[PDB]
Amino acid sequence: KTIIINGVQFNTDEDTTILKFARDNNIDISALCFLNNCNNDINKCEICTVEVEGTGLVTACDTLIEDGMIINTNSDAVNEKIKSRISQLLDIHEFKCGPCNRRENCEFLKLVIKYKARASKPFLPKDKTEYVDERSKSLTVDRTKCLLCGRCVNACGKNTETYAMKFLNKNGKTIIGAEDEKCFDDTNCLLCGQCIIACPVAALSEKSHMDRVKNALNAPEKHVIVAMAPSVRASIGELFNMGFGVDVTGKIYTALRQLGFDKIFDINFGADMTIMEEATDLVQRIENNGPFPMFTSCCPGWVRQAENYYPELLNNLSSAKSPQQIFGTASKTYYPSISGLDPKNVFTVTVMPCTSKKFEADRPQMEKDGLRDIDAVITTRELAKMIKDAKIPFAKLEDSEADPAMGEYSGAGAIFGATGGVMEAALRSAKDFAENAELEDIEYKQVRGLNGIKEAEVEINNNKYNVAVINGASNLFKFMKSGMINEKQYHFIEVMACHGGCVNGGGQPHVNPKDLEKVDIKKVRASVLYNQDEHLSKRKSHENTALVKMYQNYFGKPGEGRAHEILHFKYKKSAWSH
Ligand code: 402
Ligand code: SF4
Ligand code: SF4
Ligand code: SF4
Ligand code: SF4
Ligand code: FES
């Protein structure tokens, strides 16, 4: 073929789009509607408009390149078209970058600044109670910001295949939301927040728990514990312009101490706990040989998915609480027993890459003695804001350490944040448990990677068992619907709602669609975790000294009596009715 773009001739044989072919060279083409190799098929943004000699203005997103084409990307007509579309977008956009939370990384602001567009009538409503949906424990919607972009809808479509995010005809207007515009919590939505991740504006956000944190930090009698997720230490640095794949653990600890937090712990400790329990009940599930298989229950999105699509699998879920909740359970029981704190005056805060964790911490039965397990959950973005508003020079902070009592962790817990991490961590301990032997080879590298469905065979104590790692909700839907589950007898299965693991959660830093061509965000984020794993001396959850101490002096032996009654939570399917 022969292509002419801006006068320059290209000879190629690639069968792609104009946008892609131009971006594989250095021809700039603005785009808003195009993401995840999909565009809004109904009201196309036409931001990627170019001019094909003989045809006219076309959208480069969904236009295949052909011989004889002469393309213009910056002719007068093209830019008047784009400026037109952007102005039209501004006509329904409250561009009060006044207190906006997408200010420092908004794509729409970038487009407006680029083409210098202005609205014909500035959109400024008296009340916004009509445009705002904050009923959800995990999600908030601000339609004063929405561009009717479709990117959220497509993202939900391809990450979950649930279509919990729909287009809706709300009394004349076209909006986005849930089934019958009810609250997301009340639908089949997984609250995985991958809607937020694909959103270019402040239209979709996480339900904020920041004031919840401050009102505890300023409360005199309130002793505020804080513990972060595995992924956070490998992601938050991005929001402070530090680059991709940077370990900022010590910096995080320092910032948390500078924010007024009374105790610095880590959710990886709880990941080690979850491994203790889960490996134990895996083995007592072994020489019972049932009920097989056993699914992981640490991902709240996968939990909600099961409840809404496969409740007959709820009994096959592990009764062991997720790292967050199993940490919260110990911080209100065991931690006062080694600190002398009135447990009622204890306030546990987790830093998460997830948004579903909010819905998981506000579950009615996540209590004992009236006391919550987790009182507040903030995301990576929330922690970043909370740091910036305190004007804490994060990128230049020196490294601290957490508090060891429930803060130190093993390499097994360190890789939870990746897909296949829970699998590997569980196997390392379960094998030693069943064989009564401290094995040396602990790296299970078949379950790693970004493949959708991963399968492996392992032999625990001279007997072979089949394990599977599901990487993404849509992949769970595929794994079940395509009958792969009823192929071979599976024995242990890991499911993560977000493709790539928790490192790609709904509460993670928004990455520009023009840094994504450069960086494999999932692998780059996971790299830190996998390195932390190997450079740690203790690489198994039952090798965490603090955890062991905890188990001997409070919980007793795992999977039993005390440990079972306090540290576990099981899901019950609704009984048959009509
Ligand atoms: N609780 C919990 Fe987990 C742990 O530890 C996080 O904290 Fe994950 C991460 N990173 C998230 O969000 S959840 C499901 N499993 C694997 S990792
Ligand atoms: S969401 Fe972005 S474009 Fe919209 S007002 Fe806020 S900063 Fe400006
Ligand atoms: S909420 Fe965001 S991603 Fe979804 S259509 Fe509106 S602007 Fe696009
Ligand atoms: S949280 Fe997940 S399932 Fe719910 S609308 Fe967003 S992408 Fe879809
Ligand atoms: S995979 Fe991790 S970040 Fe995504 S919904 Fe599950 S727990 Fe949350
Ligand atoms: S980016 Fe091509 S129509 Fe939206």
Author numbering: 2 to 579
Task: Please give sentences taken from the publication describing this entry.
[FeFe]-hydrogenases represent one of natures’ most effective classes of redox enzymes catalyzing the reversible reduction of protons to dihydrogen (H2) at turnover frequencies of up to 9000 s-11–3. With their low catalytic over-potential, [FeFe]-hydrogenases represent excellent models for a regenerative and likewise economically feasible H2 production. Their active center (“H-cluster”) can be structured into a standard [4Fe-4S]-cluster ([4Fe]H) and a diiron site ([2Fe]H). Theoretical studies suggest that the most probable PT pathway comprises of strictly conserved residues E282, S319, E279, and C299 (from surface to H-cluster, numbering corresponds to CpI), including two protein-bound water molecules (Wat826, Wat1120 4XDC19, chain B) located between E279 and C29915,16,20. In this study, site-directed mutagenesis (SDM) is used to investigate the PT pathway of two [FeFe]-hydrogenases, namely CpI and HydA1, which represent the largest (M3) and smallest (M1) type of monomeric [FeFe]-hydrogenases, respectively.
Corresponding to earlier crystal structure data, for all CpI variants a space group of P1 21 1 was observed with two copies in the asymmetric unit cell (chain A and B). Conservative exchanges (e.g. E → D) maintain the functional group of the targeted position, but due to other structural differences in the substitute residue, will affect the precise spatial placement and configuration of the functional group. In a highly ordered system such as the well-distanced H-bond chain of an evolutionarily optimized PT pathway, this should at least affect the efficiency of the functional aspect. Variants E282DCpI, C299DCpI, R286ACpI, and E282ACpI were only mildly affected and showed residual activities between 30 and 90%. In case of E282CpI, a substitution for aspartic acid shifted the optimum only slightly to pH 7.5 while an exchange to alanine or glutamine rendered the enzyme most active at pH 7 and 6, respectively.
